[PDB]
């Protein structure tokens, strides 16, 4: 279902995402979406950010009872596409 989307990285560990995002060629705010080892069948967003070194910040994509998603409870979305569109 997500396989067609370029931003979705299948079979990508949390640590592999750190390496992928820290690798050269990635500007700041470079990101991807991965399957969550963190929590069963849900997804996570990993992003390139700088901490007073450069780093990868992981954000859990949490699900709603209505099937939607959110990272921050201030804004919720029907699907990931909408979430990803918003956070870009």
């Amino acid at each position: 279902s997500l396989e067609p989307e370029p931003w979705f990285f299948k079979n990508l560990s949390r640590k592999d995402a750190e390496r992928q995002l820290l690798a050269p060629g990635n500007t700041h705010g470079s990101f991807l979406i991965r399957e969550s080892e963190s929590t069963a069948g849900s997804f996570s967003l990993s992003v390139r950010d700088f901490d007073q070194g450069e780093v990868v910040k992981h954000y859990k994509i949490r699900n709603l009872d209505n099937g939607g998603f959110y990272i921050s409870p201030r804004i919720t979305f029907p699907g990931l596409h909408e979430l990803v569109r918003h956070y870009t």
């Binding site: 954000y59 009872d65 209505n66 939607g68 990272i71 409870p73 201030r74 804004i75 919720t76 909408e82």
Partner: protein, 94 residues
């Protein structure tokens, strides 16, 4: 100034490891709430979050590390998807 949904929020029962929060049942319809909690000064989303249905006016937070300052914030959603209403926050040292 600026006013929030829900309007008032307080801890009505504490143990060293958990808290029962209660808030004023709002006048407007809320489909669901989302509630964050984490150590005061956690970033960015604020810590762990969970959902409670709109009909409810209480939530129980548990598995807390005892004697630690927590920020607890409630977000009210008045439609299925979109922006939450202005949230309300409280701080509590377990």
């Amino acid at each position: 100034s600026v006013s929030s949904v829900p309007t008032k929020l307080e801890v009505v029962a504490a143990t060293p490891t958990s808290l029962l929060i209660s808030w004023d049942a709002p006048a407007v319809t809320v489909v669901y709430y989302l509630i964050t909690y984490g150590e005061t000064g956690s970033p960015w989303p604020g810590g762990q979050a969970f959902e409670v249905p709109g009909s409810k006016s209480t939530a129980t937070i548990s598995g807390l590390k005892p004697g630690v300052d927590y920020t607890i914030t409630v977000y009210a959603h008045r439609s299925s998807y979109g922006y939450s209403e202005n949230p309300i926050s409280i701080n509590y040292r377990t």
